[PDB]
XYZ file of N, CA and C in Angstrom:
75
model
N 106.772 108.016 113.312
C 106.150 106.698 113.335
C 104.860 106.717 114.148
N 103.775 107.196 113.397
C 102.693 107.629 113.961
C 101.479 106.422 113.738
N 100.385 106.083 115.157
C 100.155 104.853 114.963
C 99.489 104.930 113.271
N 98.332 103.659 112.978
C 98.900 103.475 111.772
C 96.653 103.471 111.367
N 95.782 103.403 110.680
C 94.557 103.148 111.006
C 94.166 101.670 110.411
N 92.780 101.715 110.408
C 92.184 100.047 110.566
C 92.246 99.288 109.282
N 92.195 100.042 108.437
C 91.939 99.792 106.637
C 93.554 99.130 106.506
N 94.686 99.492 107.111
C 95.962 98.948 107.182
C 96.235 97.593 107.975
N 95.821 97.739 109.077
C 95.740 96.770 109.577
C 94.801 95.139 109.238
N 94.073 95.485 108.494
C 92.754 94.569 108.151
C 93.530 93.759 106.854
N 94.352 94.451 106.347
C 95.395 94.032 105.703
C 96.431 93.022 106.140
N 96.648 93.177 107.038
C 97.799 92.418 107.532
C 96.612 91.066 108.009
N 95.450 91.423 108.856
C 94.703 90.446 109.820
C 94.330 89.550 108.633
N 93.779 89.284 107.244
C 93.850 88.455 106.689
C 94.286 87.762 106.291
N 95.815 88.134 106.040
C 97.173 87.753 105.666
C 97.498 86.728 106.479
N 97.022 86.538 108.118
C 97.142 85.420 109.004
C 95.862 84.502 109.146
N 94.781 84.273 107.985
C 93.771 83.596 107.470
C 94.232 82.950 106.880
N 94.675 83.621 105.685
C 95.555 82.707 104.323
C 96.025 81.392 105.262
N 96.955 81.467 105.903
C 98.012 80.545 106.439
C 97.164 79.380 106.794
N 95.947 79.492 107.409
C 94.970 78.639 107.184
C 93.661 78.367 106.603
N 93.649 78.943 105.567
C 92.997 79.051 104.591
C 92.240 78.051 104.048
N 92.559 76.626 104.061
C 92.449 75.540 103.494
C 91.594 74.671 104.572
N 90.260 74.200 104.513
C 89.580 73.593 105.466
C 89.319 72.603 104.661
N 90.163 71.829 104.475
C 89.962 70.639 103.631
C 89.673 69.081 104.897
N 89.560 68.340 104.786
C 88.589 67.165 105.765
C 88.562 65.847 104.896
């Protein structure tokens, strides 16, 4: 379980955008 690189992670970091995704007003 070797750490993991950035191209993986950048993956996940958008994935917690989505959730607010919506800038509706």
């Amino acid at each position: 379980q070797e750490e993991v690189s950035v191209i993986d992670a950048l993956l996940a970091d958008i994935r917690k955008g989505f959730q607010l995704r919506k800038t509706a007003r």
